[PDB]
Scaffold this motif. Structure first.
Motif, PDB file in Angstrom:
ATOM      1  N   UNK A 151      58.893 -24.407  -3.641  1.00  0.00           N
ATOM      2  CA  UNK A 151      59.460 -24.076  -2.341  1.00  0.00           C
ATOM      3  C   UNK A 151      58.597 -24.548  -1.177  1.00  0.00           C
ATOM      4  N   UNK A 152      57.373 -24.998  -1.437  1.00  0.00           N
ATOM      5  CA  UNK A 152      56.423 -25.360  -0.388  1.00  0.00           C
ATOM      6  C   UNK A 152      56.167 -26.865  -0.429  1.00  0.00           C
ATOM      7  N   UNK A 153      57.208 -27.635  -0.105  1.00  0.00           N
ATOM      8  CA  UNK A 153      57.112 -29.087  -0.214  1.00  0.00           C
ATOM      9  C   UNK A 153      56.134 -29.678   0.797  1.00  0.00           C
ATOM     10  N   UNK A 154      55.902 -28.995   1.919  1.00  0.00           N
ATOM     11  CA  UNK A 154      54.982 -29.495   2.931  1.00  0.00           C
ATOM     12  C   UNK A 154      53.525 -29.161   2.637  1.00  0.00           C
ATOM     13  N   UNK A 155      53.255 -28.312   1.642  1.00  0.00           N
ATOM     14  CA  UNK A 155      51.889 -27.923   1.300  1.00  0.00           C
ATOM     15  C   UNK A 155      51.402 -28.797   0.149  1.00  0.00           C
ATOM     16  N   UNK A 156      50.890 -29.973   0.498  1.00  0.00           N
ATOM     17  CA  UNK A 156      50.283 -30.851  -0.497  1.00  0.00           C
ATOM     18  C   UNK A 156      48.786 -30.587  -0.619  1.00  0.00           C
ATOM     19  N   UNK A 157      48.119 -30.310   0.502  1.00  0.00           N
ATOM     20  CA  UNK A 157      46.676 -30.112   0.539  1.00  0.00           C
ATOM     21  C   UNK A 157      46.275 -28.668   0.803  1.00  0.00           C
ATOM     22  N   UNK A 158      46.831 -28.046   1.841  1.00  0.00           N
ATOM     23  CA  UNK A 158      46.413 -26.717   2.263  1.00  0.00           C
ATOM     24  C   UNK A 158      47.247 -25.646   1.576  1.00  0.00           C
ATOM     25  N   UNK A 159      46.587 -24.544   1.207  1.00  0.00           N
ATOM     26  CA  UNK A 159      47.218 -23.447   0.512  1.00  0.00           C
ATOM     27  C   UNK A 159      46.360 -22.976  -0.647  1.00  0.00           C
ATOM     28  N   UNK A 160      46.970 -22.203  -1.538  1.00  0.00           N
ATOM     29  CA  UNK A 160      46.257 -21.608  -2.659  1.00  0.00           C
ATOM     30  C   UNK A 160      46.450 -22.441  -3.920  1.00  0.00           C
ATOM     31  N   UNK A 161      45.374 -22.569  -4.693  1.00  0.00           N
ATOM     32  CA  UNK A 161      45.355 -23.296  -5.960  1.00  0.00           C
ATOM     33  C   UNK A 161      45.165 -22.247  -7.054  1.00  0.00           C
ATOM     34  N   UNK A 162      46.257 -21.865  -7.707  1.00  0.00           N
ATOM     35  CA  UNK A 162      46.201 -20.767  -8.659  1.00  0.00           C
ATOM     36  C   UNK A 162      45.465 -21.175  -9.932  1.00  0.00           C
ATOM     37  N   UNK A 163      44.758 -20.209 -10.512  1.00  0.00           N
ATOM     38  CA  UNK A 163      44.253 -20.355 -11.867  1.00  0.00           C
ATOM     39  C   UNK A 163      45.401 -20.183 -12.863  1.00  0.00           C
ATOM     40  N   UNK A 164      45.142 -20.566 -14.110  1.00  0.00           N
ATOM     41  CA  UNK A 164      46.108 -20.388 -15.191  1.00  0.00           C
ATOM     42  C   UNK A 164      45.411 -19.642 -16.323  1.00  0.00           C
ATOM     43  N   UNK A 165      45.504 -18.314 -16.375  1.00  0.00           N
ATOM     44  CA  UNK A 165      44.771 -17.561 -17.403  1.00  0.00           C
ATOM     45  C   UNK A 165      44.995 -18.132 -18.795  1.00  0.00           C
ATOM     46  N   UNK A 166      43.895 -18.366 -19.511  1.00  0.00           N
ATOM     47  CA  UNK A 166      43.933 -18.960 -20.825  1.00  0.00           C
ATOM     48  C   UNK A 166      43.834 -20.471 -20.844  1.00  0.00           C
ATOM     49  N   UNK A 167      44.123 -21.125 -19.729  1.00  0.00           N
ATOM     50  CA  UNK A 167      44.155 -22.580 -19.647  1.00  0.00           C
ATOM     51  C   UNK A 167      43.279 -23.133 -18.535  1.00  0.00           C
TER      52      UNK A 167
END
Ligand SMILES: CC(C)[C@@H](NC(=O)[C@H](CS)NC(=O)CCC[C@H](N)C(=O)O)C(=O)O
Ligand SMILES: [Cl-]
Length: 329
Positions: free
Chosen positions: A79-95
């Motif tokens: 849903x956030x097509x304009x957020x290529x650089x700025x924003x949150x980078x989620x972890x992936x538990x287990x991976x």
């Protein structure tokens, strides 16, 4: 057997003053370090780093899954097509263990002509609810300009070190158009630690992030006191000591291009450490249309046959390439 890299600690305070002779002595040290392993620690820098790690961990450990999705970049939220650089980078538990938050020039607003023109690499920062993270945005924006000021002085050091006038680089580094970014990275302690998050290097070293050259003019990095970084020399990878009061500085691939490889972009990587730590790079990028004419400090005439590169397109190719090589962060 892994050796330790020579990373000198350079007092850069003269670069803020008007003692031009003192500045030349700093430039010489920068020159030597850039010609050695490529790294040096900038000390006596005047930035208050005492609470940077705590705030970084506090923000990451107090932000909720709901908030993460609401701030996630395009890679994690369609849903956030304009957020290529700025924003949150989620972890992936287990991976994927690492998580981080990236923000850009605070002056990038809907009024900015590069935002109005939808120019690549320009975005408006996304921020969490002020009431859920009191003072976070103010701290973040002020740190951006604090490290901007340090970076501007460091660039004066690099320019003098290369035989140029002190503003050779800083003149293109401006608050109203810089593409520089801050990233607030958390590396968590995990037990057990998922092996899918660990990468094994060719030489057998367990890693969290594989070899690469930085996409920047220079990188100005603060990290908490946990050794993790390594630089490749001709004699193999070498450990870079930690210094949770100084800033680790090195040249990016843009510097290596415009100097005709006189100041190479060092190849670095992140060792895997099972420990709670924070990494806060400031990537010194210029304006989208900034162009520096290459030269060769190794030639008597100082002439280079390399093509001048627009920094914006360079940044766009560098970031996508880095994701393609070492994966989405
Ligand atoms: C080694 C550190 C610099 C740090 N790594 C990093 O920050 C790595 C390598 S330089 N950075 C990247 O992958 C590029 C981030 C670009 C940023 N989202 C932006 O749009 O400006 C780490 O601690 O993993
Ligand atoms: Cl020329």
């Amino acid at each position: 057997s892994v050796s330790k890299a020579n990373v000198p600690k350079i007092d850069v305070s003269p670069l803020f003053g008007d003692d031009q002779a003192a500045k030349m002595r700093v430039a010489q040290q920068i020159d030597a370090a850039s010609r050695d392993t490529g790294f040096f620690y900038a000390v006596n820098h005047g930035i208050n780093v005492q609470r940077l790690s705590q705030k970084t961990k506090e923000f990451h450990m107090s932000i909720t899954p709901e908030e993460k999705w609401d701030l996630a970049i395009r890679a994690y939220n369609k849903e956030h097509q304009d957020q290529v650089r700025a924003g949150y980078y989620l972890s992936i538990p287990g991976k994927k263990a690492v998580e981080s938050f990236c923000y850009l020039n605070p002056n990038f607003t809907p009024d900015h002509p590069r935002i109005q023109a939808k120019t690549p690499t320009h975005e408006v920062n996304v921020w969490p609810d002020e009431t859920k993270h009191p003072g976070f945005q103010d701290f973040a924006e002020q740190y951006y300009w604090d490290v901007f000021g340090l970076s501007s002085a460091l660039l004066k050091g690099y320019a003098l070190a290369l035989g140029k006038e002190e503003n050779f680089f800083a003149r293109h580094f401006k608050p109203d158009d810089t593409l520089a970014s801050v990233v607030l990275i958390r590396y968590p302690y995990l037990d057990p630690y998922p092996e899918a998050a660990i990468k094994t290097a060719a030489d057998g070293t367990k890693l969290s992030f594989e070899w690469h050259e930085d996409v920047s003019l220079i990188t100005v990095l603060y990290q908490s006191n946990v050794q993790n970084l390594q630089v490749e020399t001709a004699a193999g990878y070498q450990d870079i000591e930690a210094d949770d009061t100084g800033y680790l500085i090195n040249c990016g691939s843009y510097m290596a291009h415009l100097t005709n490889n006189y100041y190479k972009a060092p190849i670095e990587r992140v060792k895997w450490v099972n420990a709670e730590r924070q990494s806060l790079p400031f990537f010194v990028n210029l304006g989208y249309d900034s162009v520096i004419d290459p030269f060769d400090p190794r030639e008597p005439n100082g002439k280079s046959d390399r093509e001048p590169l627009s920094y914006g397109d360079y940044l766009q190719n560098g970031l996508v390439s880095l994701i393609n090589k070492n994966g989405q962060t």
